[PDB]
Amino acid sequence: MTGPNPNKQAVELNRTSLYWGLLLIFVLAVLFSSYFFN
Amino acid sequence: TEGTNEWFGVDDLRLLAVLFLGHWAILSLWLGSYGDSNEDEDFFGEIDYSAR
Amino acid sequence: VSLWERFCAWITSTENRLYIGWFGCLMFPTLLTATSCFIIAFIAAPPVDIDGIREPVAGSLLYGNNIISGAVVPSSNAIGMHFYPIWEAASIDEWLYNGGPYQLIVLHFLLGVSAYMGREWELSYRLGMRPWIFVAFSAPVAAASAVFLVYPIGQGSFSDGMPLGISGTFNFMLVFQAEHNILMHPFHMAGVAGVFGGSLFSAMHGSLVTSSLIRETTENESTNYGYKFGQEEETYNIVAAHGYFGRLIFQYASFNNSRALHFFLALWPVVGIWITSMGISTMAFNLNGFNFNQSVVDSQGRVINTWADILNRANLGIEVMHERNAHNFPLDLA
Amino acid sequence: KSQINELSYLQVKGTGLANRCAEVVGEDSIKPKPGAKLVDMCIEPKAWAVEEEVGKAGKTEKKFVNSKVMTRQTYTLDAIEGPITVDGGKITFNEKEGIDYAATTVQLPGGERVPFLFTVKDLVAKGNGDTFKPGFQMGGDFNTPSYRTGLFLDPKGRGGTTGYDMAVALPALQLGEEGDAELFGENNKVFDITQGRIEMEVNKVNAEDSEIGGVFVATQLSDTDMGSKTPKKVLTKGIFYAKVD
Amino acid sequence: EVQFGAYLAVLLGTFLPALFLVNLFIQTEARKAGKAGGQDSD
Amino acid sequence: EVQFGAYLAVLLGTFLPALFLVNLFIQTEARKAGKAGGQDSD
Amino acid sequence: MLTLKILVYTTVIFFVSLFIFGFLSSDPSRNPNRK
Amino acid sequence: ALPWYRVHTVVLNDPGRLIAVHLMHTALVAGWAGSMALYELAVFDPSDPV
Amino acid sequence: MEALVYTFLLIGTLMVIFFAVFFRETPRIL
Ligand code: CLA
Ligand code: CLA
Ligand code: CLA
Ligand code: CLA
Ligand code: CLA
Ligand SMILES: CC(C)=CCC/C(C)=C/CC/C(C)=C/CC/C(C)=C/CC/C(C)=C/CC/C(C)=C/CC/C(C)=C/CC/C(C)=C/CC/C(C)=C/CC1=CC(=O)C(C)=C(C)C1=O
Ligand SMILES: CCCCCCCCCCCCCCCC(=O)OC[C@H](CO[C@@H]1O[C@H](CS(=O)(=O)O)[C@@H](O)[C@H](O)[C@H]1O)OC(=O)CCCCCCCCCCCCCCC
Ligand SMILES: CCCCCCCCCCCCCCCC(=O)OC[C@H](COP(=O)(O)OC[C@@H](O)CO)OC(=O)CCCCCCCCCCCCCCC
Ligand code: OEX
Ligand SMILES: [Fe+2]
Numbered sequence: 068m069t070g071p072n073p074n075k076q077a078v079e080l081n082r083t084s085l086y087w088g089l090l091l092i093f094v095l096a097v098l099f100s101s102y103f104f105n
Numbered sequence: 106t107e108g109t110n111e112w113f114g115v116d117d118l119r120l121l122a123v124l125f126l127g128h129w130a131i132l133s134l135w136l137g138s139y140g141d142s143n144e145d146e147d148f149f150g151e152i153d154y155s156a157r
Numbered sequence: 158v159s160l161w162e163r164f165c166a167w168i169t170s171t172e173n174r175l176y177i178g179w180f181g182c183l184m185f186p187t188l189l190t191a192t193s194c195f196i197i198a199f200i201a202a203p204p205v206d207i208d209g210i211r212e213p214v215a216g217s218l219l220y221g222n223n224i225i226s227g228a229v230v231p232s233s234n235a236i237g238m239h240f241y242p243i244w245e246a247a248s249i250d251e252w253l254y255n256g257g258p259y260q261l262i263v264l265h266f267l268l269g270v271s272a273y274m275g276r277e278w279e280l281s282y283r284l285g286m287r288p289w290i291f292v293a294f295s296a297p298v299a300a301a302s303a304v305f306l307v308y309p310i311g312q313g314s315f316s317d318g319m320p321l322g323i324s325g326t327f328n329f330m331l332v333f334q335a336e337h338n339i340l341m342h343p344f345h346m347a348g349v350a351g352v353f354g355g356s357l358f359s360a361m362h363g364s365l366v367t368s369s370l371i372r373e374t375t376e377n378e379s380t381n382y383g384y385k386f387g388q389e390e391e392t393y394n395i396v397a398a399h400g401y402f403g404r405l406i407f408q409y410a411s412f413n414n415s416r417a418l419h420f421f422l423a424l425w426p427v428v429g430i431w432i433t434s435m436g437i438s439t440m441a442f443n444l445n446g447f448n449f450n451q452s453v454v455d456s457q458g459r460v461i462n463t464w465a466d467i468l469n470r471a472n473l474g475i476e477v478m479h480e481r482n483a484h485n486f487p488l489d490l491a
Numbered sequence: 492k493s494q495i496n497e498l499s500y501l502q503v504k505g506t507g508l509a510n511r512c513a514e515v516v517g518e519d520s521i522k523p524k525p526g527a528k529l530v531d532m533c534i535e536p537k538a539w540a541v542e543e544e545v546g547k548a549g550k551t552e553k554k555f556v557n558s559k560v561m562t563r564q565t566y567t568l569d570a571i572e573g574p575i576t577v578d579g580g581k582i583t584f585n586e587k588e589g590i591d592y593a594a595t596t597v598q599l600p601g602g603e604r605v606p607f608l609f610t611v612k613d614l615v616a617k618g619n620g621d622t623f624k625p626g627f628q629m630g631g632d633f634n635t636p637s638y639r640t641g642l643f644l645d646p647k648g649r650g651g652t653t654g655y656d657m658a659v660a661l662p663a664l665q666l667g668e669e670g671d672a673e674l675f676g677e678n679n680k681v682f683d684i685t686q687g688r689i690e691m692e693v694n695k696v697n698a699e700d701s702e703i704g705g706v707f708v709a710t711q712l713s714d715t716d717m718g719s720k721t722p723k724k725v726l727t728k729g730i731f732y733a734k735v736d
Numbered sequence: 737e738v739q740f741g742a743y744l745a746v747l748l749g750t751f752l753p754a755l756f757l758v759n760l761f762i763q764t765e766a767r768k769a770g771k772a773g774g775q776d777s778d
Numbered sequence: 779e780v781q782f783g784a785y786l787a788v789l790l791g792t793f794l795p796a797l798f799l800v801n802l803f804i805q806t807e808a809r810k811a812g813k814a815g816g817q818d819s820d
Numbered sequence: 821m822l823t824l825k826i827l828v829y830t831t832v833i834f835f836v837s838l839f840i841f842g843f844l845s846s847d848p849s850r851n852p853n854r855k
Numbered sequence: 856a857l858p859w860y861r862v863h864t865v866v867l868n869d870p871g872r873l874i875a876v877h878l879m880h881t882a883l884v885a886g887w888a889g890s891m892a893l894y895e896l897a898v899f900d901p902s903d904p905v
Numbered sequence: 906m907e908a909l910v911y912t913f914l915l916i917g918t919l920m921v922i923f924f925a926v927f928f929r930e931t932p933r934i935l
Contacts, residue, residue: 080760088757103742108505127833138159179842244825387934763808770812820856
């Protein structure tokens with residue numbers, strides 16, 4: 068190895084942006100399912 | 106020809122030059138350190154710690 | 158200073174990630190070739206004439222199998238005991254038909270496992286350890302060489318060798334039962350006692366240590382965090398677990414010595430698998446197990462059945478059905 | 492030859508020599524006697540070809556692609572006996588005994604394995620003239636038996652003269668008036684006999700040694716596994732050798 | 737007749753990206769409970 | 779002929795429990811980076 | 821098929837010679853006791 | 856404190872890990888083209904190329 | 906189509922064997 072990277076950061080996702088990203092996936096799953104099942 | 110009674114499976118003459126250049130190419134590496142040493146230096150141990 | 162001494166210093170260095178050693182010079186090229194041919198022959202390999210009757214048995218995943226049924230098929234009955242490498246096969250298509258990769262995998266396996274065993278010796282020498290972990294590993298090496306090497310020798314063909322698979326294992330065990338009667342043989346009896354006893358004393362020793370652990374944690378965190386690595390304090394009250402088992406059976410049946418205790422855990426399985434692997438070996442040369450068929454008679458002389466006669470009728474069912482086309486003559490001499 | 496007969500058994504084995512027919516030396520004529528009986532006719536093919544649908548530039552006419560044999564050295568026929576009867580117009584041969592079948596398997600492009608029984612059973616040869624000459628050329632029909640004798644058991648355990656006759660691990664197929672008649676073809680095992688046409692051609696004779704030998708060409712039909720598939724036409728070529736006595 | 741690879745498209749198109757976005761939230765709340773130093777940091 | 783509900787059994791039997799065990803590891807390392815107070819806690 | 825065969829006898833007696841001349845390289849003296 | 860759409864900007868001031876990342880996109884592109892072409896040979900049928 | 910799942914389970918099992926050997930949590934004294 069070498070030394071520890073000084074470019075370590077942390078990732079954040081608040082409770083607000085969770086519900087956006089969940090609803091984004093389910094609505095795209097509702098929309099595109101009917102075409103994939105054909 | 107499988108069940109021929111030939112030495113080390115050496116079917117053709119070309120496979121010998123493979124064997125001789127394999128043992129000798131590492132033998133010559135080995136003689137670069139353990140060769141050209143004193144063949145007349147003993148010990149009364151069970152194990153020798155002479156040199157490299 | 159020399160190039161060889163700077164290479165011997167690296168190849169015997171314990172400062173490597175994995176110790177290579179001088180046995181790794183022929184462990185690693187052998188086992189990586191047994192591996193890289195096994196993954197290809199298990200996934201994509203055409204069917205193989207095993208019975209020598211030109212009825213090719215599918216064994217790979219691309220030819221409609223699964224994890225259970227798929228298997229690297231042993232070599233042909235037509236080859237038998239002959240050495241069959243790739244260069245003595247005149248094409249790879251002729252090699253894969255006649256059971257090619259079974260000999261390439263097995264022979265590079267038994268060299269690599271007998272070199273993995275010597276490698277366990279070597280690092281014990283360079284670390285200051287007492288040497289004999291590799292003697293305990295002799296017991297599965299004895300058993301691997303019994304079903305892949307010794308049993309094809311005494312039966313005269315690699316086709317009787319063990320198929321590298323899961324359903325092929327149970328084709329091997331049942332046909333070995335009908336032709337050799339392994340269950341009545343006292344060396345399979347001495348290793349069933351080796352692994353029933355081995356799994357007993359494993360879970361019996363592992364419970365008495367975990368029973369007598371010392372308080373070093375709270376009830377919220379894990380039990381295992383009361384052991385700091387490399388500590389010098391003993392992590393369990395061994396007097397406590399001795400007084401428990403000294404009352405659970407009686408007093409004199411308990412090892413107070415932890416060294417003699419941890420030796421008996423290594424004795425019992427390993428001796429049980431040395432003896433068992435020399436059961437397959439002595440039954441490779443058709444010295445079968447016991448045969449008590451028609452042993453109990455009345456005074457009139459009529460045969461009174463026993464449990465061995467019921468066991469015989471199970472052996473007669475597998476004997477008349479194994480290799481149902483390969484036989485032409487009334488006695489399975491092979 | 493007699494050169495092969497010089498050797499002992501330990502010098503031939505493992506060398507692939509016993510597979511190969513002899514090489515006759517020289518050319519002359521030999522006359523078949525009234526009681527003339529053919530002694531050591533061996534046939535060995537040197538090339539194989541299976542009739543397929545070939546991928547030409549734009550067309551798909553049927554052509555022969557060749558193939559690689561996969562059973563190793565087990566293809567040669569040997570020890571084929573038979574009397575040579577003299578019809579007036581043309582000399583004839585009818586084989587009687589000897590090893591006259593050699594089962595083998597060749598592989599196509601694509602990975603398809605085509606087994607076929609290579610045989611000369613019940614051969615009626617007819618050739619121009621009376622005496623064997625370097626221009627002599629005889630041939631005729633032979634009967635191919637099936638590749639499997641009827642007591643062969645398939646993976647389910649079904650044969651023509653033994654075994655079951657239904658899908659033994661599918662017990663709900665024989666329910667109803669129809670039964671299992673949807674898979675009827677894979678239950679009925681039919682022994683099949685087809686025809687084959689070999690064409691031999693003598694070109695080198697010894698009369699001082701009474702042994703002939705030349706090039707043949709044989710066509711026949713591959714196997715079907717008792718009606719499991721459509722058999723395919725198999726052409727082969729090679730060399731033979733015979734002792735005319 | 738529907739395509740049987742569409743069940744694998746939809747139910748992994750739901751679950752695999754949605755279980756991803758849950759993970760970025762759980763480690764967000766763990767860092768906030770990590771710095772806070774009381775009863776949950778450990 | 780295979781059962782087409784087995785693809786949903788296996789590929790969710792892999793992914794759903796295996797993505798679960800990843801989450802317990804990511805929030806474990808986030809709590810350790812949360813308490814540590816340097817460059818990653820936030 | 822006689823070109824592959826040449827390649828194997830190279831690779832075998834390469835590593836076999838590393839094995840043979842490995843233990844001839846004063847191998848008992850390579851212990852953590854002394855030297 | 857990075858948002859989820861800025862997580863891969865830790866490689867801006869790090870050339871040594873700029874390569875290890877660009878090698879990992881390469882190991883996925885090359886592993887695709889190998890495993891796609893293995894998938895296509897199990898599906899291809901050279902019976903009639905006309 | 907069926908054997909594609911079996912292959913993915915096998916090489917996926919060999920991945921986590923690779924990461925467990927080389928990326929192991931190295932134990933340390935003190
Ligand atoms: C280095 C480890 C190693 C070892 C031990 C083997 C061993 C073997 N391989 Mg393998 N192989 C290896 C690496 C290895 N392989 C690698 C890295 C590859 C990838 C290229 C292959 C690829 C490969 C293929 C593709 C095939 C083999 C095959 C074989 C077998 C026969 C090969 C042969 O003729 O050996 C040559 C051996 C010798 C000439 C003998 C050397 C022994 C020396 C001389 C020591 C003896 C000392 C002597 C007795 C002292 C006498 C003193 C005197 C005074 C009397 C054999 C089991 C074949 C096989 O298994 O087919 C079934 C086969 O087809 N191998
Ligand atoms: C089954 C494998 C095996 C293993 C793991 C060991 C392990 C050991 N042997 Mg040993 N040995 C064996 C078989 C084995 N032996 C056999 C069969 C013989 C008789 C030929 C010997 C003769 C022998 C002597 C004379 C010495 C050792 C020594 C040693 C120790 C150090 C390793 C060393 O330098 O030996 C080198 C390794 C060998 C000699 C055997 C290599 C075995 C290979 C890896 C696998 C088996 C292949 C087969 C036997 C070779 C056939 C070749 C042929 C096909 C061409 C170690 C405990 C040394 C020691 O410490 O003694 C105190 C020592 O001086 N062994
Ligand atoms: C209650 C039932 C019972 C029990 C407990 C046993 C118990 C046993 N039977 Mg037995 N048997 C039974 C019923 C039973 N039998 C019945 C009913 C039959 C008749 C069908 C048989 C027929 C039978 C046969 C025919 C055989 C046994 C054998 C054995 C032994 C197996 C141990 C073994 O092979 O490990 C030993 C370990 C190995 C073989 C593995 C070696 C693996 C090497 C060292 C390394 C492999 C590494 C791997 C590739 C990769 C590692 C992981 C990787 C990711 C790194 C054991 C004593 C076998 C035997 O006698 O011993 C040989 C045997 O051949 N039995
Ligand atoms: C009902 C419970 C039971 C019991 C008591 C046994 C007992 C036995 N089985 Mg068995 N078995 C069982 C269930 C049982 N089995 C089941 C459910 C199966 C699977 C279907 C098998 C399958 C099986 C196979 C396949 C084999 C056995 C064998 C054996 C024998 C040795 C096993 C052994 O040493 O294990 C290891 C355990 C120990 C070493 C602990 C000690 C066990 C002994 C018997 C108790 C000692 C107490 C002593 C007699 C009393 C005096 C002491 C006193 C002074 C305090 C032994 C007679 C083997 C055999 O045939 O041997 C002849 C054998 O081959 N069994
Ligand atoms: C050559 C290609 C390339 C490269 C190397 C980058 C590199 C970068 N972009 Mg950029 N970008 C690109 C193309 C590229 N971009 C394109 C084409 C667009 C238009 C869509 C954008 C739009 C864009 C925006 C709007 C932003 C960036 C940002 C960034 C930086 C961080 C990326 C990040 O955090 O994402 C992390 C991403 C994730 C954690 C998950 C993303 C999930 C995606 C949406 C779906 C999954 C991807 C899918 C599997 C890919 C299939 C392959 C397909 C591309 C063929 C980084 C310097 C950010 C920036 O400016 O840095 C401060 C930013 O805010 N990019
Ligand atoms: C008066 C009237 C009415 C008349 C009728 C007469 C009458 C009263 C009759 C009744 C009498 C009657 C039958 C009573 C007898 C009672 C009796 C014994 C009945 C039970 C019957 C029976 C079959 C018993 C025999 C079975 C038995 C219990 C066998 C014991 C087996 C045995 C000896 C095992 C030892 C195995 C062993 C060596 C284990 C140690 C190895 C091991 C790894 C242990 C782990 C371990 C051990 C340690 O040591 C310590 C330290 C630690 C750390 C540790 O890990
Ligand atoms: C009708 C014929 C009658 C029988 C005839 C005899 C035939 C041959 C019998 C062979 C006897 C061999 C004696 C070996 C002694 C020995 O091992 O000591 C090793 C130590 C020494 O004891 C330890 O010894 C130490 C004292 S000292 O070393 O002994 O001085 C002490 O510190 C320690 O506490 C103590 O545990 O003992 C132990 O650690 C316990 C293991 C005992 C093993 C013996 C049982 C036999 C093997 C099990 C059966 C096979 C297993 C597989 C079965 C499938
Ligand atoms: C092969 C591997 C497959 C990889 C797939 C994995 C990635 C998949 C998921 C990533 C995308 C996640 C999007 C997160 C979403 C997210 O977290 O939002 C938050 C994000 C930015 O938020 P901030 O900058 O406030 O973030 C602060 C940080 O603390 C957290 O981000 O917003 C966006 O990036 C743009 C807004 C998109 C928000 C969606 C708007 C559309 C609303 C939904 C519309 C549907 C309803 C329609 C009704 C008609
Ligand atoms: O190869 Mn496998 O199994 Ca031994 O027995 Mn004889 O050979 Mn065949 O029969 Mn039974
Ligand atoms: Fe212990």
